[PDB]
Amino acid sequence: TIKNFTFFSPNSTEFPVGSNNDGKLYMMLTGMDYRTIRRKDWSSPLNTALNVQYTNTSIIAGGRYFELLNETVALKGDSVNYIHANIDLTQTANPVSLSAETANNSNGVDINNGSGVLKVCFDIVTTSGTGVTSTKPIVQTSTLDSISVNDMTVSGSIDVPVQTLTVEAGNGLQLQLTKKNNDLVIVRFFGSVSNIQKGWNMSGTWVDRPFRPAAVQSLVGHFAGRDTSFHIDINPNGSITWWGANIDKTPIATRGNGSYFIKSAW
Amino acid sequence: PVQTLTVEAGNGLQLQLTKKNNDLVIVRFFGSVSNIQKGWNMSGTWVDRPFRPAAVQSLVGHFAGRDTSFHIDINPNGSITWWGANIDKTPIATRGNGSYFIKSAW
């Protein structure tokens, strides 16, 4: 069966739009699940003793839009109050109610497909014995798939994938590689090098394919407690070439951070 | 009836409170205080509601083996304010009995 909504009803009866159908539509347009909200304080809520008056706040919960117009919720003293919007569709006259609770009791109940009361926390109000000391809103989550954007401004942080690899390069040299967004790599040198000549390939493990650069990368390192330095080349094939001076039998501690890009242009 | 409470007030100070008839409290000081300044709220646990007085109570204490003293204020809100001199990194043993009434005339 296919149930159509955003279509012409030839005889004005074919496709009526039910509130749960619009609920699902709206959830899909904004990219929200049953565990988040859309919320906007058009005017500031007002705190009076152990109460919060929502003067003009709009909320979308489970794709259902409602407005809090001079709606006061009573609070517990000396407590962290979790303010919830509770939707009970069977309460035909008043489906929505607000509650102040001791914990975040958001239940993710699918009210558009099934039975039950949807509870979703949208505000955290901390009190003293006499009134409100602080308020923190619950985050509004947008769950998206693939985004094409021109410009973006981030006020908090971007979390990208991170991969790590330790390479026993040979001759006592160790590399600890950290790759972020599958592109930027920071190499940290460890260990102590001995028995190597300039231009010689190091005697150990080659860099794993996921960390290999598209072009040769020369990474500068330093000898601990000395005024001397070295460099190594991480070749596109994964091999590592020594480009410091010749090192004898006595190991010298190797340290330092070097960065490279795995990906080139295009 | 008798109720007891141990408060780790912070900065190494420990209060052992005994309340009788739900009114008269005797505070016994224990522990050793360090890293505190005059007028500063102590860094630990506040006094539980059943032991909080209606009005601020200043309780005199003594530094063991010294001729020096201190006082703390148990505030109606449960907080404890240090009113001795500034204390450095070296803790000095704090002792003494102080009494207060929870209830005023009502």
Partner: nanobody, 122 residues
Framework: VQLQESGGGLVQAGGSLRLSCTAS????????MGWFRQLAGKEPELVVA????????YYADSVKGRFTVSRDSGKNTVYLQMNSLKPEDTAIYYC????????????????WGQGTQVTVSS
Amino acid sequence: VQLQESGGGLVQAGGSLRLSCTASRRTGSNWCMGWFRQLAGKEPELVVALNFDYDMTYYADSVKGRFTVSRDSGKNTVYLQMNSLKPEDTAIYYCAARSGGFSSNRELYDGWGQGTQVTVSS
């Protein structure tokens, strides 16, 4: 527990300026009224505070002998007379008030203000 933050603006280095703050009510005993400083995007820190019940002041070592905190009658109003100003002193000065004495912790303060911006010109 509402706060008013009168006074504050622009002045030259080595000069003088003032700050005013009034609290709607006092939350209890050991009533402390003062100011938290926030320089170059760093963490906010208490710099000037007055214990009303004890008439005892606290000044951070960095501002000692330069700043003076005063009280006006029983109006629950605090003033900061800032003399011999420095470029480092350019920060956002929020008004803080609480019952229980002086504290480094933000949360322990019953009253927190908007924050008046201090700009020490060079």
